[PDB]
From a paper:
Immunity proteins protect the colicin producing, or “colicinogenic”, bacteria by binding and inactivating colicin nucleases with very high affinity (Kd ≈ 10− 14 M) and specificity; the discrimination in binding affinity between cognate and non-cognate nucleases by Im proteins can be up to 10 orders of magnitude. In the context of [name] bacteriocins, the HNH motif, which coordinates a single divalent metal ion within its centre, binds to the minor groove of genomic DNA causing random cleavages that overwhelm the DNA repair machinery of the cell and result in death within minutes of intoxication. The immunity protein associated with [name] colicins has an unusual mode of action; rather than binding directly to the [name] catalytic core, these proteins associate with the nuclease domain at an exosite adjacent to the enzyme active site. In this work, we have solved the first structures of the [name] domains of pyocins S2 and [name] in complex with their cognate Im proteins, in addition to the structure of the isolated pyocin [name] [name] domain.
We first determined the crystal structure of pyocin [name] [name] in isolation to (i) verify that pyocin DNases adopt the HNH/ββα-Me fold and (ii) establish if Im binding causes any structural changes in the protein. Pyocin [name] [name] domain protein crystals diffracted X-rays to 1.5 Å resolution and were found to belong to the P41212 space group. [name] [name] domain adopts the typical mixed α/β HNH fold seen in other [name] bacteriocins. This fold is essentially identical to that of the colicin E9 and E2 DNases with RMSD values of 0.83 Å and 0.63 Å, respectively, for Cα atoms. Interestingly, [name] [name] possesses a positively charged C-terminal extension (LKRKEK) that is not present in other nuclease domains. As with the archetypal ColE9 structure, the HNH/ββα-Me motif resembles a zinc finger where three histidine side chains coordinate a metal ion. In the [name] [name] structure, the Ni2 + ion displays octahedral coordination geometry, which is coordinated by His738, His763 and His767; by a single water molecule from solution; and by the hydroxyl and a carbonyl oxygen from a citrate anion within the crystallisation solution. The citrate provides the equivalent coordination that is provided by the phosphate anion present in DNA bound forms of colicin DNases. We found that the [name] [name] is most active in the presence of Ni2 + or Mg2 + ions whilst showing no detectable activity in the presence of Zn2 +. The two conserved water molecules that are seen in the pyocin [name] [name]–Im complex are also observed in the apo [name] [name] structure.
Author numbering: 643 to 775
The structure:
Amino acid sequence: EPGVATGNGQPVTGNWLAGASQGDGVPIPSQIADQLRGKEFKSWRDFREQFWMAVSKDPSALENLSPSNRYFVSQGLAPYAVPEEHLGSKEKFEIHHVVPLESGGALYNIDNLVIVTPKRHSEIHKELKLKRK
Ligand code: NI
């Protein structure tokens, strides 16, 4: 579903992915949002690839990735999370829609995105489901 990205992200210092395994996940750094906002995307896959390429071009965001993960984001691929944070065949950091798409959330609004591990993304959706009761 094609669209235009919007949103600004957050000012982030330090290790921007450390919190991806916990809580609400981590916001998108504003300097990554700046490389995407206003651009048109053909599909979610297109956005995801350009998102990780934007990460690859930012020294601050690259600094807390392993060397192998720096290679992968330079190819527009998501970096791998540690094994304890995998969920079935899902092994890489995921972009989660904070208000889910299925709950009226925006697809390419960067302020509706966080990064989460596969394990934490699944937990967040379980928790959202429970809280409907
Ligand atoms: Ni999600």
